[PDB]
Amino acid sequence: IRKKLVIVGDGACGKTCLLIVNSKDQFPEVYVPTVFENYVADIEVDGKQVELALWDTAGLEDYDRLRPLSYPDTDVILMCFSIDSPDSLENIPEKWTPEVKHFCPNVPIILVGNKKDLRNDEHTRRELAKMKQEPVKPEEGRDMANRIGAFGYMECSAKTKDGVREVFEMATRAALQ
């Protein structure tokens, strides 16, 4: 069984790192903005054997006209924000859902909060407190998931691996149904 996954979301919100930790076990050393990229992951869910094509896309506006070339015939979308960036969550209904809904109107969406390891990070909390902000709360992520009609809401850390497996298990289930 082959299924296609496309990952989207604000620049630097952790998309590439999430695909790599899942499919190569290594955590990339240098932050390099994505143009486009492809990876493959073999996953097994409910005794079903699945070869998941992972289509990585650009968060940078520089590449907005390129990103839609990745959408044909998608089976599941991972729509991401970073827990260290409340504005990246605000941009989910502003830009990511409108775009996905247009190109892939009925494809299931998993809303994914990345960088969970930064929720309790002192530097992050101090930096955001300067703007009278704080890390995204799980309740806020889950509210947004409901608002946009996502299949599910998941949090993870590519850095520590917490929750990564479950994101891809959920995405595969979604892709199969």
Binding site for ligand GNP (CB under 6 A): 11-17, 31, 33-34, 58-60, 114-115, 117-118, 157-159
Which of Mg ion, ligand GNP, none has residue 172 at its interface (CB below 5 to 8 Å by kind)? none
Which of ligand GNP, Mg ion, none has residue 67 at its interface (CB below 5 to 8 Å by kind)? none
In DSSP terms, 154 is beta-bridged to: 112
* Smaller CB separation from ligand GNP, 18 or 107: 18
Tell me how far, at minimum, the Cβ of 46 lies from ligand GNP, in Å. Answer: 27
**91 touches Mg ion (CB under 5 A):** yes
- Do 167 and 18 form a contact (C-beta atoms < 8 A)? yes
Pick out residues in 69-88 that bind Mg ion (CB under 5 A). none
**Dihedral sign (CA 19, 22, 25, 27):** positive
| Neighbouring C-beta atoms of residue 44, cutoff 10 Å | 10
**Dihedral sign (CA 3, 9, 11, 15):** negative
Size, binding site for Mg ion by CB under 5 A = 5
- Which of 92, 96, 174 has its CA nearest to residue 140? 92
* Smaller CB separation from Mg ion, 44 or 98: 98
Which of Mg ion, ligand GNP, none has residue 91 at its interface (CB below 5 to 8 Å by kind)? Mg ion
**94 touches Mg ion (CB under 5 A):** yes
- Sequence-ordered list of residues with C-beta below 8 angstroms from that of 92, at least 6 positions apart, any chain: 9, 79, 81, 111, 144, 148
Pick out residues in 125-164 that bind Mg ion (CB under 5 A). none
